[PDB]
Amino acid sequence: SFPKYEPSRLASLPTTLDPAEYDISSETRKAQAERLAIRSRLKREYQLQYNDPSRRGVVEDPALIRWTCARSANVYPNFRPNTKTSLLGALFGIGPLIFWYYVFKTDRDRKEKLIQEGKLDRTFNISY
Amino acid sequence: SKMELPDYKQWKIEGTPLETVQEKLAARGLRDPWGRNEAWRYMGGFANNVSFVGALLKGFKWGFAAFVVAVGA
Amino acid sequence: DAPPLTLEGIKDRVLYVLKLYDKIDPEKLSVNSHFMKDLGLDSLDQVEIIMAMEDEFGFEIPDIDAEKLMCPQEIVDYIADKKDVYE
Amino acid sequence: ADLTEYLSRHYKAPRMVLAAAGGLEHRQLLDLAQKHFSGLSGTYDEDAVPTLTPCRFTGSEIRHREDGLPLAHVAIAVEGPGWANPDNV
Amino acid sequence: FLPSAAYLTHQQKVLQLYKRALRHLESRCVHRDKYRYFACLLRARFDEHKNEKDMVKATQLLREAEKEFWHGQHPQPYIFPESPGGTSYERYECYKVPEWCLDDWHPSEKAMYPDYFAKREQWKKLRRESWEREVKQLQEETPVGGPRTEALPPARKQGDLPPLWWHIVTRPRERP
Structure with missing residues (x-):
């Protein structure tokens, strides 16, 4: 009684109609249990290194530092110049630049010719 | 600390909207409401609050006398 | 903007709104009683009790917490945890 | 282990049918079921239950050329009615 | 995705759909008494098929229930002014x-x-x-x-x- 809710890059699929939560495999329940075990161990050691009154400072998250060094320092390695990278580089580095270049030369030549004749609004045009 | 909490067996519902919907739901064949929880939402100093046009009728249930006095002034 | 509350008063209010309900008797309604065992209501009516007291007290409790009330004493305790009832 | 999982997941008392025909009473077979088939598994695992996903008929062709056989076998097929509609009839 | 278990006990999924449908019908229906009527009709519709002893029939009805719920949902549910996404959502957080x-x-x-x-x-x-x-x-x-x-x-x-x-x-x- 509906068009069945197409998903998309904005259309977030809600957890009601998955529909992969219908024919659940027993190994998928085992994967959910392993996920519970991972979160259990991580929150356990968080509450170990978090509630210590002898401790003073910050929590020292290794994963956030991992993400930051992945995002900043781990860019240039690894890299190989492929077809997609070179093409997209030429498309985002040269394309709009030469676009604004030609439109600025075009509008400038219009202005240059219209003041070369002399039929401008220079009746008073003081603040150049 | 007392609040004295005006108790149960006081409503005994009897009210018109819940009575009509209990009779309709009984003729439908269910006969299982929540209970008398809407009685203090329905009656007391409640139960014939005025309608829409009566709120605009509230404007002239006292001002005509003073208006005719001011016209006579 | 300062509503006073007390544990015995809110206990009596929750007991009162339980006693308002139909299919349990107003005679035998304990402070410390089960729901599924002795009062004669199923899971569905129990969550209807939950819904009505959410609607009256103005804050929901989740279904991840709705599995595990089972008795009015823990109801008064959890709502007192939400309200932090001392002077 | 996988065969054990098959037996624990699939052969289930809610989805199985005992049917018989011949010179035997319906209440007699009821009695035999009440002895034996009353008290089966009747209890699923952790919600790991099958349901008929709507199958995606593509419609395409496969051919297996092998030229050492005396005869050739060609099958062709189109859509089905299912079971419910009188289109099956 | 839950604290205690890994699965979430299918009865509880039915109960979650019950609470969310009842809340969305609160948001759908003002005047509270026609609301009581509609809620008792929905409660009766759930009790039409309570004692089905199967599981595949139950989850098929669950799939169709999710379809009818997602079709007949409401955009702004009446979420309370303490609920997440509500009016307050730690309104007086300033002194924490x-x-x-x-x-x-x-x-x-x-x-x-x-x-x-x-x-x-x-x-x-x-x-x-x-x-x-x-x-x-x-x-x-x-x-x-x-x-x-x-x-x-x-x-x-x-x-x-x-x-x-x-x-x-x-x-x-x-x-x-």
């Missing part, structure tokens, strides 16, 4: 200093409030005294190397506190 602080005050103001600071010192005694042996031994002894849960056991041994109590007990009043 966690009480690891307040030891960094100047001792003139600490002379101004003597009773609370001496009693804070005796809570600090209570925190430090039970911290090492009982708490660490119960965390390292009764769980397996895979902890497998999020709940912590009570200190039923003889005396003092079950672990991790500090941040759980000493969180603010939620209305300053």
Whole structure:
């Protein structure tokens, strides 16, 4: 009684109609249990290194530092110049630049010719 | 600390909207409401609050006398 | 903007709104009683009790917490945890 | 282990049918079921239950050329009615 | 995605759909008595097929229920002004200093409030005294190397506190 809710890059699929939560495999329940075990161990050691009154400072998250060094320092390695990278580089580095270049030369030549004749609004045009 | 909490067996519902919907739901064949929880939402100093046009009728249930006095002034 | 509350008063209010309900008797309604065992209501009516007291007290409790009330004493305790009832 | 999982997941008392025909009473077979088939598994695992996903008929062709056989076998097929509609009839 | 288990006990999924449908019908229907009528009709519709002993028929009805619910939902449910996404959503969050602080005050103001600071010192005694042996031994002894849960056991041994109590007990009043 509906068009069945197409998903998309904005259309977030809600957890009601998955529909992969219908024919659940027993190994998928085992994967959910392993996920519970991972979160259990991580929150356990968080509450170990978090509630210590002898401790003073910050929590020292290794994963956030991992993400930051992945995002900043781990860019240039690894890299190989492929077809997609070179093409997209030429498309985002040269394309709009030469676009604004030609439109600025075009509008400038219009202005240059219209003041070369002399039929401008220079009746008073003081603040150049 | 007392609040004295005006108790149960006081409503005994009897009210018109819940009575009509209990009779309709009984003729439908269910006969299982929540209970008398809407009685203090329905009656007391409640139960014939005025309608829409009566709120605009509230404007002239006292001002005509003073208006005719001011016209006579 | 300062509503006073007390544990015995809110206990009596929750007991009162339980006693308002139909299919349990107003005679035998304990402070410390089960729901599924002795009062004669199923899971569905129990969550209807939950819904009505959410609607009256103005804050929901989740279904991840709705599995595990089972008795009015823990109801008064959890709502007192939400309200932090001392002077 | 996988065969054990098959037996624990699939052969289930809610989805199985005992049917018989011949010179035997319906209440007699009821009695035999009440002895034996009353008290089966009747209890699923952790919600790991099958349901008929709507199958995606593509419609395409496969051919297996092998030229050492005396005869050739060609099958062709189109859509089905299912079971419910009188289109099956 | 839940604290205790990994699966979520299919009856509970039905109950979640019950609560969300009932809440969305609250949002759908004003006047409260036609609402009571519609809620009892929905409750009767659920009780039409309560005692189905199958499971594949149950989850098929669940799939069709999700389709009819997602079709007949409502855009703005009446979520309470304490609920997440609601009107408040920690409206008076402004005065939520966690009480690891307040030891960094100047001792003139600490002379101004003597009773609370001496009693804070005796809570600090209570925190430090039970911290090492009982708490660490119960965390390292009764769980397996895979902890497998999020709940912590009570200190039923003889005396003092079950672990991790500090941040759980000493969180603010939620209305300053």
